[PDB]
Amino acid sequence: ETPPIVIDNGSYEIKFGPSTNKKPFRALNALAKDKFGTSYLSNHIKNIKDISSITFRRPHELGQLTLWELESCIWDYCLFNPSEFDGFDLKEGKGHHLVASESCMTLPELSKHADQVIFEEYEFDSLFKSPVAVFVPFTKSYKGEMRTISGKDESDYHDFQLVIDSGFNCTWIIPVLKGIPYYKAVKKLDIGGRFLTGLLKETLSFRHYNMMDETILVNNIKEQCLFVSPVSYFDSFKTKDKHALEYVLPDFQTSFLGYVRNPRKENVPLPEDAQIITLTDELFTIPETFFHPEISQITKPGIVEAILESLSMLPEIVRPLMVGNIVCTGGNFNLPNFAQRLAAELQRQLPTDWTCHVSVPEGDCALFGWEVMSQFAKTDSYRKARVTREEYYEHGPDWCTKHRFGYQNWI
Amino acid sequence: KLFKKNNQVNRVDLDFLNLVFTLNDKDLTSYHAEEISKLTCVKNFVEEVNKLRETNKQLQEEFGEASFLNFQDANQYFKYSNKQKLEGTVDMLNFLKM
Amino acid sequence: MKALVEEIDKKTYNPDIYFTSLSRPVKRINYSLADLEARLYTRYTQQEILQSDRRFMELNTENFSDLPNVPTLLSDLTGVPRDRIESTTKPIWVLKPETLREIQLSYKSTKLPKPKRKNTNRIVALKKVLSSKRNLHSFLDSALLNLMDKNVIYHNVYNKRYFKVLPLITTCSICGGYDSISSCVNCGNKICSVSCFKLHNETRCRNR
Amino acid sequence: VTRTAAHTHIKGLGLDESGVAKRVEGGFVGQIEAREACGVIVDLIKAKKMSGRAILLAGGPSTGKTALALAISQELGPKVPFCPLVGSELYSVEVKKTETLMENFRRAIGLRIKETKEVYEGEVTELTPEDAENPLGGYGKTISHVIVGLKSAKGTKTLRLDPTIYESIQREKVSIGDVIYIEANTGAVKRVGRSDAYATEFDLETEEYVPLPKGEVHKKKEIVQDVTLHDLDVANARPQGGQDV
Ligand SMILES: Nc1ncnc2c1ncn2[C@@H]1O[C@H](COP(=O)(O)OP(=O)(O)O)[C@@H](O)[C@H]1O
Ligand SMILES: Nc1ncnc2c1ncn2[C@@H]1O[C@H](COP(=O)(O)OP(=O)(O)O)[C@@H](O)[C@H]1O
Ligand code: BEF
Ligand SMILES: [Mg+2]
Ligand SMILES: [Zn+2]
Ligand SMILES: [Zn+2]
């Protein structure tokens, strides 16, 4: 089997798909049960009617994934269903190859569980797991559309790359030199989608009734109507009376998901009996906790403090080279005006002789990471980088995760 | 304060141009002024500029095509130090003329 | 206008320390025993860092049922004992075999497995790894990870030198008004407008 | 709205390229010889070679002499300096009428200059004397100058200043963490305010909080500022004013 399977393991959503297809198959990674006791599958969460009382139980914790039974059952559902996903099917998978993605700071024992489950259970011939930051130097192997933003302005892989990957779990800043991550300068940002979602449930619980019981509705509002301040919090706060968005709640008898209504847009003249929630301050208050954590009362340092500390641990020759090549991946970078704000606030702290450039791809960045992650398999270095099955059967189970797939060898 | 608006954009200082010399007999003599204004040189900053113009031109003529270009200075270990050297000595080239 | 002559005492007056001051009113006295004993036995303070971590992890959690189980894990991550920092700081299962049979009924509609097993030691390890039912705290309590591994994974990734680079912004706690920066009386909470105070006196004022 | 006081209906002489004046053009009716001859005077000022030429306009009231004077003043344009003056205004008791007359002859001429100036700005970090810690005998090291470390956004640089501009720095009551504006060639000092990093130090403060200035520390630009030669004569005559005693 020549084309392998590209599976990106995440906390919110696991993106799987073959190497031939251009776009991955989106499937969630959770197990939701209702208050009545009915348990639904992860892809069937969007099909149910009532989103009021939903208990979310997922095998992925904040650090890593601990339970491989529910995650392995999700893998059996996504890989073993030909009728659920159009065109995709797999009979056994003994000759197929797998490209997986794990965390950079994962535990070694859970990685032994991963290599034993994937290697022994699924009978893969060769597998190469690596974090998402290592696939980022392989962007230049193929020609693609990627927007470049200059902060100062008003083989095929490259050595110097700076990877800032925001996620649902947390945000990681991983510097990459010679295609290898430098783990002494990696910084962790604890701000993620759970803090924006829970913070929006707290602010909406103070301005209105407590929406903490419903997480999918606040997740949809946070995905739809949220935007980052382009200039500052003060200029966006003086324009909070002109810029406002009105969200109508989805009534369970009529509509499963709500709709965002703009007061400038007269395209929705249909009246309804439901009430509308006004959103003025929470539009720009929620994404401002990355740069300024004083608004959310947390003692976190901030994103650019971890960027400057991440550049502080690097050698002085590699400091002005990594700031010229910055690629941003993840779902939190899909918010508008976040790249120019991050490049501007990063430009206001860097020295004059160094010029900062931030390259953010068009569209969703997680699908971009799956696309370049699929373009890594087409590279000829993957044939030398892959580990055979008989080599794993010869060596111990701890050697393959400790030496080649481990961060401790690169330290 | 309404007439302390931005004047220094459209104002000359007129004290730097040696035109308030009606106050120059307070602390300057005649032979101090002739002996002080006989002695103002060009051709020494021209010497320090010309001794650095050789080091500017040997890097500009050889590596000046891809040195200052942002495409080659994006990811390079040897070219970026030559770029910062050239942009470092251009400021020292114009500064001595200033 | 300004008086050029000012009468002043020698002992009472100091030029530096200047002080001016003026149904039933009664000063607020806390009847709590741990508050009085806590007062008599005593850049951000460490207890406020613990409050920010506890509020950050309570705001990090998704479900109501997972709220009391989180400060045990946060107390495992910090290193301080659980019962002391849980008693001093006030804040603000997953797997079942029958449920796994319900997921087997969920994906039972379309599947293509091939079952083939042989008794080996790696298959006993497969049955141990596949059926785990262990929390992340149980993995942190295990001796399989090194102490330097836990220090590098948890304590070394956070930034040490740079605490604050960007300018700090204080806003109102109700609507975030920066045009009126006015900290309250009993709590010292920043309140901008009049409706923010009238909504502040009822719910968000604990020290009143 | 629009104020009209016996003028503003004339937008110049309104002559053709051949020279022949129209009957109805540019707020003028009739008067061909004074308008076309006045345009010959307009080209005579556009020659930039002639001097000493005196052309009087003689006529009765309501005939258009001052209107022709606004016609040549509007036909010349804003780039050519125009000095309106009345002969009754030349009488002075401070100086003679000779000095006001020849002074007005120095007021008519203009001279445009171009010059570059250096712009420094940033947040004040340290105000401290220099050491260079060998004593050399010459000093228990200082004569009181101050190194001003201006922290800008895109750069951090330290600069040494004169005691006069340091005296104006003491006049502006700045401290550690205040955004200032300092000009190199002139020496003038303007304070913008306290930086935004110290806004959370006190809840209420009379000093406004301004953001950090974007860009480098050292900036340069060129101006095409015009300044009359009489303004250079007053600049050569008497001291105007400074920030020192
Ligand atoms: N268009 C969007 N607007 C705002 N937020 C988005 C958008 N798309 C995705 N997100 C956020 O990104 C998160 C998904 O990130 P994901 O790529 O799943 O991270 P991980 O790699 O940790 O699984 C979601 O929680 C969602 O809140
Ligand atoms: N040819 C003309 N076209 C238009 N307006 C004229 C003309 N001649 C005279 N006037 C008008 O007559 C008014 C008075 O003439 P003025 O030039 O003041 O006379 P004098 O120069 O003798 O004082 C002016 O406001 C002007 O508008
Ligand atoms: F694990 Be995800 F990338 F936050
Ligand atoms: Mg990810
Ligand atoms: Zn408010
Ligand atoms: Zn209060």
Describe the structure.
The structure is cut from a larger assembly and holds chains A (411 residues), B (98 residues), C (208 residues) and D (245 residues). Chain A is of the alpha+beta class and 411 residues long. Chain A has helices at 68-79, 108-121, 132-135, 193-207, 216-224, 233-238, 282-285, 303-312, 319-322, 338-347, 365-375, 381-385, 389-394, 397-404, 407-410; strands at 5-8, 13-18, 25-28, 31-34, 39-40, 54-57, 97-100, 126-129, 146-150, 161-165, 171-177, 180-181, 187-189, 245-248, 259-261, 276-279, 326-329, 357-361, 387-388. In chain A, strands 9, 10, 11, 12, 13, 17 and 18 form a 7-stranded mixed β-sheet that branches. A 6-stranded mixed β-sheet of chain A has the order 3-2-1-7-8-19. In chain A, helix 2 (108-121) packs across helix 14. The longest helix of chain A has 15 residues, at 193-207. Chain B is mostly helical and 98 residues long. Chain C has helices at 33-40, 46-58, 70-78, 82-88, 97-106, 121-130, 136-141, 147-155, 194-198. With 245 residues, chain D is of the alpha+beta class. In chain D, strands 1, 2, 3, 4, 5, 6 and 7 form a 7-stranded mixed β-sheet that branches. In chain D, strand 2 (147-151) and strand 3 form a beta hairpin. The radius of gyration of chain D is 28 Å and the shape is elongated. The interface between A and C is large, with 86 and 69 residues. The complex binds adenosine-5'-diphosphate (2 copies), beryllium trifluoride ion (BEF), magnesium ion and zinc ion (ZN) (2 copies). Residues 10, 132, 167 of chain A line the site of magnesium ion.
